């Protein structure tokens, strides 16, 4: 506990133990946690100053101080029972009572002027409360990674609270953090879903694919070492024992840094960075440049005499070899595309080795699979370029509403709004880095949607895509065609009742309400052309800009016009 305090430092240690205590005890107030944090820091500094304290000589002390919460009986009944248990069982029992989506209040982001005042008047009390608040709202979310957002949030506040128009400064930077943080919370949930739902082999494959792309100058042996190491750390990070998940992540971070030459040049920045930030930086590292003049996969994976021999001798390792060579050659491909190829390659080699001449039987078949997302990025990033972030969200909104109108309107807005944000972040990345970027943000937004589909299931079609494999989630969602079986929702004047709100509203709130209406319009009349949607959208555009008095009358013109025009 002394050794841990020194490497993280007091500010990160106090923040981590606050995050960690917020993650375990989600239902004691902030002041109860601060009390525990200051008592733990005082106690860690006892160990740092002396180490002679018999209490000092990490899992146990964390568990001990958990049990020092009095309101454990009242507030968190089932959670407090672990204090009866001894420490092998006790810490395992504690991790069991963390709540994945704890359905606490939506955190209200106050006005930028308000936040900046509280950040001036008492910044740590400000940040540390909101950290605690985010941390108890996300208990599985890896405590140091969340601390990197707190630092990024403190960075956003320190830079934007002094700025000209702090709305124009901070609100984009808080949206950047909320979105990256929502992406980073949802990435953690997905990678832990991956391990359970699709299996260790599927995760390892992804790991192989991810690590081979990120570290192409690394050996397959080296990648395979990291892939398993990575799989252990995630296994520990999904369980929710954050101390052992952190140890294993740091163990791997210190391992990657000791073997950089055999792994990647790009890790130099990360390996210089401290223990706390090492893991995250290695995870965030740029793909190294692929080695000068590597041979295409057709020699060692089609034309070699030893293809079916080496495949049958170790099916995971050879397909992992295949994945490795392909992913190192193609960091431009999504990790799930490389797994699609690997799965296809497996499917061919199961067929081809049994087939009389495997050489003739067994790379052409990858060209449709590669082109499909690469055309999807191209189409969508053409549609993003020509329409811009908002109108692209609307393109998708009508697309995904028509496709799966059974899904609730706020979800359809938010998925499509976040899918616009996927489009926004990844179309700005070059053609090479486009599909990987998407994969990441897209798979987050799709797993977000499938988690929203858990405990509000609405469509057969979306649930098929969610219950489809890791590799097949997005193709299935792309494969979604307009629901011809959707009986259109009854004309709902409530949704198409436009109050005066829209003009004064900030573009975000204005956009969502327009988008809300646009979903409900497409739910009312799904058989309604792009031209007919442009007709209603530019009826609305002329109507809102021309417009308290007008909304009731001129609005009801547009509505009757639209009901007629669409069928
Ligand atoms: C992560 C920890 C952040 C501590 C400071 C955050 C203050 C709140 C800013 C608004 C939060 C949000 O973007 O929803
Ligand atoms: C009390 C605070 C205990 C902190 C446990 C987690 C340590 C995180 C180490 C950083 C890392 O490797 O990501
Ligand atoms: C360094 C310890 C764990 C960090 C992961 C490093 C692997 C680099 C590839 C990035 C894969 C996603 C991040 C992750 O697996 O945690
Ligand atoms: C979810 C479908 C993925 C299918 C990918 C087929 C290739 C599997 C390779 C598994 C990698 C083994 C890991 C290792 O080499 O250590
Ligand atoms: C609920 C709405 C379902 C959204 C489907 C998202 C499709 C994501 C992949 C991008 C694409 O195929 O256009
Ligand atoms: C009965 C149909 C009424 C619903 C109309 C919803 C249209 C919303 C999308 C158009 C947004 C206007 C363009 C703009 O000002 O940004």
Which class do the helix and strand fractions yield?
Answer: mainly alpha
Rounded radius of gyration (Å): 26 Å
Element-by-element helix/strand order: HHHHHHHHHHHHHHHHHHHHHHHHHHHH
| CATH fold-level label of the largest domain | Serum Albumin, Chain A, Domain 1
**Secondary structure: helix percent:** over 70%
Q: How many domains make up the coordinates?
A: 6
The total of helices stands at 28
**Shape-level CATH architecture of the largest domain:** Orthogonal Bundle
Question: Termini, distance in Å?
Answer: 70 Å
Name the shape in a single word: globular
Instruction: Tell me the β content.
Output: under 5%
Site (Aspirin-acetylated lysine): 191
Family: Belongs to the ALB/AFP/VDB family.
Modified residues (N6-succinyllysine): 197, 425, 508
GO biological process, one term: cellular response to calcium ion starvation
Features:
Serum Albumin, Chain A, Domain 1; 567 residues; cleavage on pair of basic residues; mainly alpha; Albumin; 28 helices
Structure description:
It is classed as transport protein. Keywords: Human serum albumin, Fatty acid. It forms a monomeric assembly. This protein is an all-alpha fold and 567 residues long. The protein is 71% helix and 0% strand. Helix 2 packs across helix 8, helix 9 crosses helix 10 (200-214) and helix 23 (460-467) runs antiparallel to helix 24 (473-479). The longest helix has 38 residues, at 366-403. The chain starts with a helix and ends with a helix. The structure holds myristic acid (6 copies). The site of one myristic acid has 12 residues, from helix 10, helix 11, helix 12 and helix 14.
């Amino acid at each position: 506990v002394a050794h841990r305090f020194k490497d993280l430092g007091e500010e990160n240690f106090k923040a981590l133990v606050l995050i960690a205590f917020a993650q375990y005890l989600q239902q004691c107030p902030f002041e109860d946690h601060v009390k525990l944090v200051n008592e733990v820091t005082e106690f860690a500094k006892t160990c740092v100053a002396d180490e002679s304290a018999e209490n000092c000589d990490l899992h146990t002390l964390f568990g001990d101080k958990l049990c020092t919460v009095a309101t454990l009986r009242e507030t968190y009944g089932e959670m407090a029972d672990c204090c009866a248990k001894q420490e092998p069982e006790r810490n395992e029992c504690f991790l069991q009572h963390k709540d994945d989506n704890p359905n606490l209040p939506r955190l209200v982001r106050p006005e930028v002027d308000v936040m900046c005042t509280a950040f001036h008047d008492n910044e740590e009390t400000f940040l540390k409360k909101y950290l605690y608040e985010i941390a108890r709202r996300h208990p599985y979310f890896y405590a140091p990674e969340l601390l990197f957002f707190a630092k990024r949030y403190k960075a956003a506040f320190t830079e934007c609270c002094q700025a000209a128009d702090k709305a124009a400064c901070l609100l984009p930077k808080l949206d950047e953090l909320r979105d990256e943080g929502k992406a980073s919370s949802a990435k953690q949930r997905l990678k832990c879903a991956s391990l359970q739902k699709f299996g260790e082999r599927a995760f390892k494959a992804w790991a192989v694919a991810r690590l081979s792309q990120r570290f192409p100058k690394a050996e397959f042996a080296e990648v395979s070492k990291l892939v398993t190491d990575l799989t252990k750390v995630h296994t520990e990070c999904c369980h929710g024992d954050l101390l052992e998940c952190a140890d294993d992540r740091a163990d791997l971070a210190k391992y990657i840094c000791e073997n950089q030459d055999s792994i990647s040049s790009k890790l130099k920045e990360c390996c210089e960075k401290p223990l706390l930030e090492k893991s995250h930086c290695i995870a965030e590292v740029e793909n190294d440049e692929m080695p000068a003049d590597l041979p295409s996969l057709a020699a060692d994976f089609v034309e070699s005499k030893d293809v079916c021999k080496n495949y049958a001798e170790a099916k995971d390792v050879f397909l992992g070899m295949f994945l490795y060579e392909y992913a190192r050659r193609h960091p431009d491909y999504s990790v799930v595309l490389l797994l699609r190829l690997a799965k296809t390659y497996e499917t061919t080699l199961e067929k081809c080795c049994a087939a009389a001449d495997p050489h003739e039987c067994y790379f052409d078949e990858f060209k449709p699979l590669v082109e499909e997302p690469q055309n999807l990025i191209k189409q969508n990033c053409e549609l993003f370029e020509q329409l811009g972030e908002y109108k692209f969200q609307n393109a998708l909104l009508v697309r995904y509403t028509k496709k799966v109108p059974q899904v609730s309107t706020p979800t359809l807005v938010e998925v499509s709004r976040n899918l616009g944000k996927v489009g926004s972040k990844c179309c700005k990345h070059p053609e090479a880095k486009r599909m990987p970027c998407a994969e990441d943000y897209l798979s987050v937004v799709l797993n977000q949607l499938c988690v929203l589909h858990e405990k509000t299931p609405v469509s057969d079609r979306v649930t098929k895509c969610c219950t489809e494999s890791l590799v097949n989630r997005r193709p299935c969602f792309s494969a979604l065609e307009v629901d011809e079986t959707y009986v259109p929702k009854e004309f709902n004047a409530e949704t198409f009742t436009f109050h005066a709100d829209i003009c004064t509203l900030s573009e975000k709130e204005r956009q969502i309400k327009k988008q809300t209406a646009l979903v409900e319009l497409v739910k009312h009349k799904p058989k309604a052309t792009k031209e007919q949607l442009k007709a209603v959208m530019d009826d609305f555009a002329a109507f809102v800009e021309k417009c308290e008095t007008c909304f009731a009358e001129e609005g009801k013109k547009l509505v009757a016009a639209s009901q007629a025009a669409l069928g």
